């Protein structure tokens, strides 16, 4: 019973010789963030370390990084002793040597490029034995600590002359190379990722443990995404960091195979992985192999289908293996494959949202050089419908430009074999800038599952229906026990309903950003884009999207549109919207679901969508009063630079009856008002300038930085109501006597 | 499905040897039992794994006894002993029918203003008589594609021959006659083929069949013919005594405070249905987390800006539901069913049987 | 065509020589002309031989990484006939468009065939270069 027997977690820390501890763990362990341990490994192999603190890490884990981890002989959920060494000293003479995979491409120097940076003001333990790794230069680098003189492990002290001379040696065997993937070359995906490590890792950590249980484990894993999302990369990197055996079947390279050959190449795959459990076989692109039953023709194609779900269900009387699989889309699999005992469970691996594509261009510009203006949130906000593959192709490109115009400036003696043009390089901002534009993206018309951006700010007014939104949505998730004690059940449904343009669109984001629930956006001309015979499964696929990404706000925006189809035969509006409703009735309400649809035309609504149990609390969201125009037209102006002359509350009292689409509609004219007089003003000085050329004063500085009183008053004077005064009466009307519409009505 | 709940239990388990994993993991890697022995299951465990389980059964239609008794629908007295006499009566007793020389009915409609409790009649009785219970929606028939209503509608008949003595009730139809006219012919099909069925069934295996309807005045006259559903049974909105009994029925789990007078609610609102009397039990219900929620953030705000209190006391500050609560629900309230409909009702209530000629 | 002219086995095998002898001779490009007659839509196949040929042609394009310094072109009348499984990543992933001309271009046209002919002296091109559009 020793506390300091530790186990490996991931690293957030990107130093190379930096552990990190919790702190209660330090104290009772004797250590402090200044320390240098020793830390002990399998086949007696050790390393030296400088531990620093952390909240995040846990008491019973240790965080290291993965050169150490390989430095160790140690995978994933290991074990590791620690102890304190102030018995370090500082050395004379170390003689480090390049391994000969990474030096294949650079000749000439390699101390002043790589090694000179590396060792300054850092001061780092090192210890003979030990691979290290550097970065720079559009390549990475590797090194083996051979020898130190105060043998064996020392500080590198300016003391130590640093041998680099020599010829770059062999590997060992049994050295794990860093050119392998592992969990840090996986960015975006953090959830499916924990998803994949707590299904896999504990039966192939542990077999013999697990076998003596009596539970079963699970045994297909099927992955799916759009193309370009990293799902080969995934499960290499299961692979490699479990260390099971691994054996990948592709899907063209069976198909391409005559017939007997192709059933022989699938049943050797299942046999040689009998052999050599634990394994994971990893069946690359299915529905190649196995496509729908309709789209196969002939006995062949049937037959390895037939083949496959053989082996599948024959697994159970063999020992610890695991079949993955990976997919465009779920739907165009043969539906046997799908029960139980054969690929049963799914994870979905979607596009990235913005911290995602951040984390990838952080994974790819790692060996290159940027210049010091480069500042990747702004291309991570600019790229959207970027799939990693396209990040990374984006980042290949402006790399390239950079090295075109170095052959632009240096092509004459470039061809040798340089070092100082590759120290010289450096990749700016216009780079990025040119190769966002010539970038085709993939997934537009993807549907986007993320959280929101628009807070409570964005929207001006609406004060009790903020509340309101409140006690619907937030209640129920953050306190289910009050609702378990007085004995009501949640809602499921809103409606929201009024003239257009007043914000229900914003609202319906605010909320969901608000309870910090994902929120997918769906519009009436969407479904109806949906064809004759495809609108099923297209308006199942989205219940299914909202069931698997809960909690989750599922938003039906323009309904008008689908009720206007409707009589102009309009046969695809009644389909579509019977087809919602049955839906609704089979969604129950403890997964936290919850549905939210808009109207600007709440007389031709379908009345069966209000029905107690569907869509049934009616909010009535109206035109703005005079306070609220104040508070819209503040909210527009937060990132406009406005005179202190302006008056808004005037700009309220003069617009009366606006909605709040006219109040954006003044700001935005009167922006291009500004625009237009500081662009002749440029002409104007640029033509006197170049007429009376040496001129005494050049004074160059914004003419009107700012807008005044002048714009919006001219603005003023072209501005147009969008709801006309008979609209406000019959909204006024609807507005009481809308929940009447089930009966006969009117 | 059973494959799903053996997964369920499976993954509990799993969650608790992981959690004995954060504890002991170590010496773990050796065969104890002792580790088994102390291995335990809690209920957050089955809590968990309920949340992230994937049921696979849920378009597949349900045949059961329903859960809803006599108990739950309030009023509606003298409709009670009309449908034991139809669906009870030859089921029990085959004697009688046999003796006096008639031949009992197949099909009943109910038909009425929105919201009156037709739902819950029909589910009430096939608990009384503990016989299977099959519903079906109009927009679940209208889902039902062009050349696939076919099997689908033969299906369900077969389903309730299989499973008798059954109830097979068609919720909705109403949505099935707004499809025709607006070219609706979807609608025509269906109504088609589900009267055809009707004629081929034969009262051997007691099957008994229901519909409901808010639009009496757009149904298509063939289905009241004698053979189908020709009882016509009228469910009116309800009177004063009526909605003191729906108001207690829906407040039997609620925790309600003594104060309460639920006869001056239901002098108070006069032309509710039943679904407005609930909308105003949910309205007061929120009233109240509300409160709770405002005086426990107020607590926790007062407990720990003034730390070492001298009371410890936690407790709830309101455990029921009282005047104040109802009383502001009650401005809110709105009704559903307009005057001029409830005239048009009252005079459907009448005329009904008439349409199968040239009628209106 | 000449490809899909030749019988099954002889197919496949003129396809793999190609790209092995332009592993031999690196750099190379390879150019494939008429892509849609090889590797059509998978609704517009039938049988085994085709789909056979289709997925030989995938399993090489993939296999390009583990070579050095091959560039492989190919040419189709457009681009919605193709199997989509080739329009991937790491595989025909670049694609540029060649459009009809404009004017300037169809002026340049005709100065280039007529480089080894004698003109009158009235002929003046720019007219018939206003004069054909849609050539
Ligand atoms: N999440 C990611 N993080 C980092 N790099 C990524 C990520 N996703 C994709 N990439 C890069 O994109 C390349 C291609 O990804 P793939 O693993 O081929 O994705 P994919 O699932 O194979 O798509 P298909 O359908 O097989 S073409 C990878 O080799 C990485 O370089
Ligand atoms: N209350 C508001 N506060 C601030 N900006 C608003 C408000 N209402 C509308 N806007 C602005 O007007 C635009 C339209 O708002 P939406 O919420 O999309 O309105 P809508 O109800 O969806 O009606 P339409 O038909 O979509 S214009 C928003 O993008 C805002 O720029
Ligand atoms: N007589 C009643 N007694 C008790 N609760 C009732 C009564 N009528 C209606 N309710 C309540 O109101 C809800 C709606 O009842 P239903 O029987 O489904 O009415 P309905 O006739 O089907 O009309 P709709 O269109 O379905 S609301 C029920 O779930 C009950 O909660
Ligand atoms: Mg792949
Ligand atoms: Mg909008
Ligand atoms: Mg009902």
């Known amino acids: 019973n020793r506390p300091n027997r530790l186990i490996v977690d991931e690293a957030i820390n990107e130093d190379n010789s930096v552990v990190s501890l919790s702190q209660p763990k330090m104290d009772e362990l004797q250590l402090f963030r200044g320390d240098t341990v020793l830390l002990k490994g399998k086949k007696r192999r050790e390393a030296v370390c400088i531990v620093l603190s952390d909240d995040t890490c846990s008491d019973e884990k240790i965080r290291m990084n993965r050169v150490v981890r390989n430095n160790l002989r140690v995978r994933l959920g290991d074990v590791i002793s620690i102890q304190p060494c102030p018995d370090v000293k500082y050395g004379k003479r170390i003689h480090v040597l390049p391994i000969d995979d990474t030096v294949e491409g650079i000749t000439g120097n390699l101390f002043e490029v790589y090694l000179k940076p590396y060792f300054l003001e850092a001061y780092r333990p090192i210890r003979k034995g030990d691979i290290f790794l550097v970065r720079g230069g559009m390549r990475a680098v590797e090194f083996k600590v051979v020898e130190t003189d105060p043998s064996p492990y020392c500080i590198v002290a300016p003391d130590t002359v640093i041998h680099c001379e020599g010829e770059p040696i062999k590997r060992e065997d049994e050295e794990e190379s860093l050119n392998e993937v592992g969990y840090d070359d996986i960015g975006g995906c953090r ?154 469970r799914e994870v979905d691996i979607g596009i990235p949202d913005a911290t995602g594509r951040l984390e990838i261009l952080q994974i790819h510009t790692k060996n290159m050089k940027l210049a010091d203006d480069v500042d990747l949130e702004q291309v991570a906000n600019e790229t959207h419908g970027h799939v990693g593959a396209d990040l990374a192709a984006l980042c290949s490109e402006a790399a390239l430009q950079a090295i075109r115009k170095k052959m632009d400036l240096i092509d004459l003696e470039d061809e040798t074999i340089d070092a100082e043009v590759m120290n010289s390089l450096a990749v700016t901002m216009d780079d990025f800038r040119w190769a966002l534009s010539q970038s085709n993206p993939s997934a537009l018309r993807e549907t986007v599952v993320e959280v929101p951006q628009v807070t409570w700010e964005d929207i001006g007014g609406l004060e009790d229906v903020k509340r309101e939104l409140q006690e619907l949505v937030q209640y129920p998730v953050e306190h289910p026990d009050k609702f378990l004690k007085f004995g009501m059940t949640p809602s499921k449904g809103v409606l929201f309903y009024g003239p257009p343009g007043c914000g229900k669109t914003l609202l319906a984001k605010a909320i969901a950003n608000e ?164 662009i002749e003003s440029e002409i104007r000085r640029e033509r006197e300038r170049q007429t009376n050329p040496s001129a005494m004063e050049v004074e160059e500085d914004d003419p009107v930085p700012e807008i005044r009183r002048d714009h919006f008053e001219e603005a003023m004077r072209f501005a147009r109501r969008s709801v006309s005064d008979n609209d406000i009466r019959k909204y006024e009307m609807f507005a009481q006597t809308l929940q009447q519409s089930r009966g006969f009505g009117s």
């Open 191 to 344: 959830k499916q990722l924990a998803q994949i490590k707590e299904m896999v890792e504990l039966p192939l950590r542990h077999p013999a443990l697990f076998k003596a249980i009596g539970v079963k484990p699970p045994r297909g894993i099927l992955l799916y995404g759009p193309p370009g999302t990293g799902k080969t990369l995934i499960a290499r990197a299961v692979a490699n960091e479990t260390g099971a055996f691994f054996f990948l079947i592709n899907g063209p390279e069976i198909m391409s195979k005559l017939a007997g050959e192709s059933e022989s190449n699938l049943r050797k795959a299942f046999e040689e992985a009998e052999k050599n459990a634990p394994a994971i076989i990893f069946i690359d692109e299915l529905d190649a192999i196995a496509p729908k039953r309709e789209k196969t023709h002939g006995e062949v194609e049937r037959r390895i289908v037939s083949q496959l779900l053989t082996l599948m269900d024959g697994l159970k009387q063999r020992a610890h293996v695991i079949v993955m699989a990976a997919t465009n889309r779920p739907n165009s699999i043969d539906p046997a494959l799908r029960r139980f005992g054969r690929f049963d």
């Open 515 to 678: 309870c910090q629930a994902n929120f997918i956006s769906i519009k009436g001309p969407e479904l109806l884009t949906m064809w004759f015979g495809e609108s099923e499964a297209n308006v199942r696929e989205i219940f299914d999207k909202a069931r698997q990404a809960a909690p989750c706000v599922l938003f039906f925006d323009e309904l008008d549109s689908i009720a206007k189809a409707r009589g102009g035969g309009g046969g695809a509006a009644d389909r579509v919207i019977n087809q919602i409703l049955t839906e609704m009735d089979g969604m129950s309400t403890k997964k936290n679901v919850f549905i939210i649809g808009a109207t600007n035309r709440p007389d031709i609504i379908d009345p069966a969508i209000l029905r107690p149990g569907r869509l049934d609390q009616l909010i009535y969201i109206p035109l703005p009063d005079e306070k609220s125009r104040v508070a819209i037209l503040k909210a527009n102006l937060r990132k406009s630079p406005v005179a202190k002359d302006v008056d808004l509350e005037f700009l309220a009292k003069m617009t009366n009856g606006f909605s709040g689409a006219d109040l954006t509609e003044i700001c935005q004219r009167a922006c291009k008002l500004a625009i237009r007089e500081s």
